[PDB]
Amino acid sequence: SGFRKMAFPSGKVEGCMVQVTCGTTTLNGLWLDDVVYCPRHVICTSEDMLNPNYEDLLIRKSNHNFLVQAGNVQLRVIGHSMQNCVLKLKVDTANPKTPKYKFVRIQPGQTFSVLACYNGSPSGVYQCAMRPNFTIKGSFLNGSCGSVGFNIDYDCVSFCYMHHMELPTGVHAGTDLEGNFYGPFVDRQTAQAAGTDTTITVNVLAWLYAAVINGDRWFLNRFTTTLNDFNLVAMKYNYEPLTQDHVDILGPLSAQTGIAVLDMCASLKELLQNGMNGRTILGSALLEDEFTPFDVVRQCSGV
Amino acid sequence: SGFRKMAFPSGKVEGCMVQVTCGTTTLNGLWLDDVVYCPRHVICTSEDMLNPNYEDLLIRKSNHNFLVQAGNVQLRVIGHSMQNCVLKLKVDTANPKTPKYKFVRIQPGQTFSVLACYNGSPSGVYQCAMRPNFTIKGSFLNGSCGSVGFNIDYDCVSFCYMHHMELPTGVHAGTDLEGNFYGPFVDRQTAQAAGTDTTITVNVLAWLYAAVINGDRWFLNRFTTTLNDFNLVAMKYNYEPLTQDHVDILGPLSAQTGIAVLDMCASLKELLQNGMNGRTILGSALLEDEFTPFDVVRQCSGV
Ligand SMILES: *C(=O)[C@H](C[C@@H]1CCCNC1=O)NC(=O)[C@H](CC(C)C)NC(=O)[C@H](Cc1ccccc1)NC(=O)/C=C/c1ccccc1
Ligand SMILES: *C(=O)[C@H](C[C@@H]1CCCNC1=O)NC(=O)[C@H](CC(C)C)NC(=O)[C@H](Cc1ccccc1)NC(=O)/C=C/c1ccccc1
């Protein structure tokens, strides 16, 4: 028993982290085979933060402008290119620690582990969800760029996030590993706003099932609702619409607990309209939406 | 900026996990140099559970009754001994991945990272605190015994916890790596109940400082209190007494924010007496007590 915000074991990714310096700017790089991936804004100066044209800063760079350090071993850069908002630095050594890996782009509402690093050295690991507005609520300080997000399936690391920036609201924005930003953000010093966020309804339901599996039952009731009547309540509270595919995805948790999805929806509607009246669910006084149905099944395997 | 429950990178410990089987019972072991450490209840059977004489059970075992597997490689057990509630299995191979390490026993109120494992294979990593009643609120299923808790300083792994059991309340109990239980628990079958828990006051104050560092300021006030008057309120709400050493430990966070410790205590008193009136702090509607002052400093480093 127990339910915790759990990250994937980070060992396979730790072996991929290097330090990339260009000018007086240092950040993190991801070393896979003979390529190091890093945010392209490593080539920017104090003087070009509002109007940066990145082909040219790049055209004006040479291979020797990039110092790549793996531990205390210097890697020789033998080629450089831009891929959207990331740089690909070809180095003269394939990383012997390269895991089996994939570059996947994730969907809002999906979760991943972040390995926070500074100067190529990992600091900590934690779980994040991609918000409906394509930001993430992380923990990132100056020097955290090149910190990657990932999932692991058996021995294959699916990289999904590279960190680039913090917004004025304190939330975080980045790219997939092809260098394409999540959301309407750009790698400039512009104060940018994300759109309005919403709550990931299917995840809240999954976490309620986690609660039941773990013995928290006080919020259950006889009642059931229709999908239509639930979604009318959901939109009033800034919750995302629940689709039939969401209902289907919750099937296995529904079967394990014997609580029909639309029954659990009736509990959620009451929680939304009444609050908790001083009680907690799995140690929380708020409704939690950063656990996917997969996250619950993986962790609550067998109770 | 940002504040998350963050675990240490788990790579160094992943390289130490093995699978230990004796009879029909499989659990995890910790392989350091030429010794594998595991819970001694691996040698118990279905019908000796309520009070095994472990020491009778061990004299009846031989080296070949213990099968140890590191990945896909069987390790030969060449010796076995009991140290309190753990077993030391001497193997014929020193683990080439052994980090610099220490066996430390932690205090209630301190935190550590848990690498949850099954069949010698790591599943996830998360942060735990040792409760004042010597339990931990973890996520542990059947097969997770022998999973370890640890902190990392520089590149030295300080192991502090090995998992043994779940209490009827759903919380978890284990030993240090010398096999001595945290708290009044035994690796046998009784009606084991935790003693009454309390909230870790110094940690709540540390987390309030993290909140300020991260721009959550609504709970601040212009009052200050005396340590005596605060501790009278703390005792009323099941909070641990705040000592002058606690105030001293909070010094650096006090200086960084310019909020004197006893001023922050005045905010905490009002939070305890009024609640939050529907507001949140660092995304929480409850007062969080599983971040130490060190956890905050290390993460809210330089704003
Ligand atoms: C890379 O390591 C770094 C990480 C972020 C910086 C520190 C805070 N948390 C982080 O994750 N990424 C950047 O520095 C990035 C470089 C750009 C994309 C070229 N910039 C930022 O993240 C933010 C964007 C921003 C700009 C203006 C307002 C609000 C957000 N830049 C800053 O935070 C700097 C703000 C600043 C500096 C000096 C004086 C006043 C304000
Ligand atoms: C080792 O892997 C295992 C992990 C725990 C078991 C599964 C639940 N979560 C865990 O962390 N540790 C044990 O199995 C341990 C072995 C003892 C110490 C020799 N036992 C337990 O953790 C609990 C103790 C307990 C016993 C009775 C009531 C409450 C708690 N044992 C059980 O959970 C088994 C309960 C049970 C089994 C079969 C029928 C009815 C109840």
CA distance A227 to A245: 12
φ, ψ at A131 (rounded to 5°):
-70, 155
Check CB contact of B51 with chain A, cutoff 8 Å: no
Domain containing B237: what range?
201-300
Q: Which helix (H) or strand (E) is A74 found in, with range?
A: strand A73-75
Check CB contact of A151 with chain B, cutoff 8 Å: no
N-terminal to C-terminal alpha carbon distance within chain B: 6
- Residues B101, B102, B103, CA angle at the centre, nearest 5°? 135
> Ligand 1 test: best mutation among A166, A171, A192, most atoms within 8 Å of CB?
A166
Q: Is A252 helix (H, G, I), strand (E, B) or coil?
A: helix
DSSP state of A251: H
CA distance B39 to B42: 6
Count other C-beta atoms under 10 Å from residue A23's C-beta: 14
φ, ψ at B202 (rounded to 5°):
-60, -35
Tokens coding A209: 């099932």
Q: If you search the block for the tokens 């986690």, which residue do you land on?
A: A210
Q: Min CA distance, B35 vs chain A (Å)?
A: 22
φ, ψ at B195 (rounded to 5°):
-65, 170
Side chain identity, residue A217: R
- Residues A192, A196, A200, CA angle at the centre, nearest 5°? 125
Secondary structure of chain B as H, E, C letters: CCCCCCECCCHHHHCCEEEEEECCEEEEEEEECCEEEEEHHHHCCHHHCCCCCHHHHHHCCCHHHCEEEECCEEECEEEEEEECCEEEEEECCCCCCCCEEEECCCCCCCEEEEEEEECCEEEEEEEEECCCCCCECCCCCCCCCCCEEEEEECCEEEEEEEEEEECCCCCEEEECCCCCECCCCCCCCCCCCCCCCCECHHHHHHHHHHHHHCCCCCCCCCCCCCHHHHHHHHHHCCECCCCHHHHHHCHHHHHHHCCCHHHHHHHHHHHHHHCCCCCCECCECCCCCCCCHHHHHHHCCCC
CA distance A208 to A188: 40
Of B289, B300, B272, B293, give the one whose Cα is nearest residue B137.
B289
> Are residues B235 and B242 in contact, defined by beta-carbon separation less than 8 angstroms?
no
Give the total residue count for chain A.
303
In the reported structure, the alpha carbon of residue A57 is separated from the centroid of ligand 2 by a whole-number distance in angstroms of: 62
Count other C-beta atoms under 10 Å from residue B96's C-beta: 6
A30-66 in b/e form (b: 16+ CB < 10 A) is bbbebbbbbbbbbbbeeebeeebebeebeeebeeeeb
CA distance B286 to B276: 8
Cβ contact A303–B138 (<8 Å): no
Asked if A41 is an active-site residue, the reply is yes
Q: Which helix (H) or strand (E) is A91 found in, with range?
A: strand A86-91
Report how far Cα A47 is from the mean position of its chain's Cα atoms: 31
Instruction: Give me the catalytic one of A16, A128, A145, A265.
Output: A145
Count other C-beta atoms under 10 Å from residue A128's C-beta: 24
Report how far Cα B238 is from the mean position of its chain's Cα atoms: 21
Residue B188, class by beta-carbon neighbours within 10 Å (0-12 exposed, 13-18 middle, 19+ buried)? Answer: middle
Of A148, A147, A150, A156, give the one whose Cα is nearest residue A111.
A150
Of A45, A41, A39, give the one whose Cα is nearest residue A88.
A39
B132-159 in b/e form (b: 16+ CB < 10 A) is bbbbbbbbbbebbbbbbbbbbeeeebbb
Radius of gyration for chain A, computed over Cα atoms and rounded to the nearest angstrom: 22
- Provide the sign of the torsion angle of the four alpha carbons B110, B115, B116, B117, taken in this order: negative
Q: What kind of experiment solved this structure?
A: X-ray
Of all residues in chain B, the one with the smallest CA distance to A299 is: B139
> Are residues A137 and B283 in contact, defined by beta-carbon separation less than 8 angstroms?
yes
Report how far Cα A270 is from the mean position of its chain's Cα atoms: 30
DSSP state of A266: H
Q: If you search the block for the tokens 């609050």, which residue do you land on?
A: A275
Q: Is A215 helix (H, G, I), strand (E, B) or coil?
A: coil
Count other C-beta atoms under 10 Å from residue B39's C-beta: 26
Please enumerate in sequence order all residues whose Cβ is within 8 A of that of A53, keeping only pairs 6 or more positions apart, or say none: none
> Are residues B290 and B128 in contact, defined by beta-carbon separation less than 8 angstroms?
yes
Q: Is A213 helix (H, G, I), strand (E, B) or coil?
A: helix
Cβ contact A303–B11 (<8 Å): no
Strand partners, A89: A36, A80
Cβ contact B115–A9 (<8 Å): yes
CA distance B252 to B210: 12
Cβ contact A126–B6 (<8 Å): yes
CA distance B230 to A257: 45
The CA dihedral of B168, B170, B171, B176, to the nearest 10 degrees, is 70
- Provide the sign of the torsion angle of the four alpha carbons A219, A225, A228, A229, taken in this order: negative
In the reported structure, the alpha carbon of residue A180 is separated from the centroid of ligand 2 by a whole-number distance in angstroms of: 48
* CA dist B272 → A115, A281, B68, B132 (Å): 35, 20, 51, 19
> Are residues B279 and B287 in contact, defined by beta-carbon separation less than 8 angstroms?
no
Count other C-beta atoms under 10 Å from residue A152's C-beta: 23
The CA dihedral of B268, B274, B275, B279, to the nearest 10 degrees, is -100
Side chain identity, residue B89: L
Q: Which helix (H) or strand (E) is A271 found in, with range?
A: helix A261-274
Instruction: Give me the catalytic one of B145, B160, B265, B300.
Output: B145
Asked if B172 is an active-site residue, the reply is no
> Are residues B28 and B118 in contact, defined by beta-carbon separation less than 8 angstroms?
yes
Q: What is the CATH number of the domain that holds B291?
A: 1.10.1840.10
CA distance A219 to A242: 20
N-terminal to C-terminal alpha carbon distance within chain A: 6
**Alpha helices for A11-86 (secondary structure H):** 11-14, 54-59
Side chain identity, residue B167: L
Please enumerate in sequence order all residues whose Cβ is within 8 A of that of A101, keeping only pairs 6 or more positions apart, or say none: A32, A156, A157, A158, A159
CA distance B114 to B294: 18
> Are residues A41 and A26 in contact, defined by beta-carbon separation less than 8 angstroms?
no
> Are residues A209 and A250 in contact, defined by beta-carbon separation less than 8 angstroms?
yes
Tokens coding B190: 């009784």
In the reported structure, the alpha carbon of residue B14 is separated from the centroid of ligand 2 by a whole-number distance in angstroms of: 25
> Are residues B209 and B250 in contact, defined by beta-carbon separation less than 8 angstroms?
yes
Of B122, B110, B151, B127, give the one whose Cα is nearest residue B30.
B122
φ, ψ at B127 (rounded to 5°):
-95, 140
Q: Is A261 helix (H, G, I), strand (E, B) or coil?
A: helix
Of A31, A29, A21, give the one whose Cα is nearest residue A61.
A21
CA distance B266 to B221: 7
**Alpha helices for A47-97 (secondary structure H):** 54-59
Resolution (A): 1.7
